[PDB]
Predict the structure.
Amino acid sequence: MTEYKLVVVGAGGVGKSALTIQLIQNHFVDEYDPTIEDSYRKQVVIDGETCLLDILDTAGQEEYSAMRDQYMRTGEGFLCVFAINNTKSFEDIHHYREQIKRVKDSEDVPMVLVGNKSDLPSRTVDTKQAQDLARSYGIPFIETSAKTRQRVEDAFYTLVREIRQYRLK
Ligand SMILES: O=C1c2cc(ccc2O)S(=O)(=O)/N=C2\Sc3c(Cl)ccc(O)c3N2CCCCCN1C1CCNCC1
Ligand SMILES: Nc1nc2c(ncn2[C@@H]2O[C@H](COP(=O)(O)OP(=O)(O)O)[C@@H](O)[C@H]2O)c(=O)[nH]1
Ligand SMILES: [Mg+2]
């Protein structure tokens, strides 16, 4: 058993809850109250390791929050989610990365950039712009659909793999 403390952040409505609940409970939620902040624990096997994932699905995204500072201190990896049909949510990404780096007082922050809602046809964020942003940060970029489950496990398992790479640096 190895524990991994993951935190899902991103603007309201991008699919943080839907992604987390798809991973843990294998169903898509259409109407999950946006103010619910809670953790979900589950054992999974990734690269031959039995992993305990302890995932915090965050609700409020306010800068000034003692509890956000605390979960940024405690969290080991961060899933930074935007929606591919919401340019503003893509612009919010750099603020989250900045907040997390400040709390960690480190450049070494395990992070995965997730462009969710890949099933929606009216894209506003070009995949290649998101790939450029991820490259600039030195982090993986994955597009997911919580609705169809596309790359949901990939997003969270990639974040686990990032935490291991960092545990050796
Ligand atoms: O009271 C909380 C709660 C607790 C905390 C932060 C935010 C938050 O909404 S905490 O920092 O004191 N606990 C953490 S941080 C954390 C991380 Cl970074 C990953 C996985 C975690 O499980 C985790 N936790 C504990 C889980 C907090 C759940 C959210 N929560 C209440 C707890 C009582 N039941 C309703 C949700
Ligand atoms: N089409 C589509 N809708 C999604 C997807 N993920 C979430 N949603 C919807 O977007 C809305 C917000 O999702 P939610 O998970 O509550 O967002 P959160 O505020 O980031 O937790 C809900 O109506 C979801 O059903 C997705 O991958 N595709
Ligand atoms: Mg939510």
Q: What stands out?
A: The chain has one domain: 2-167.
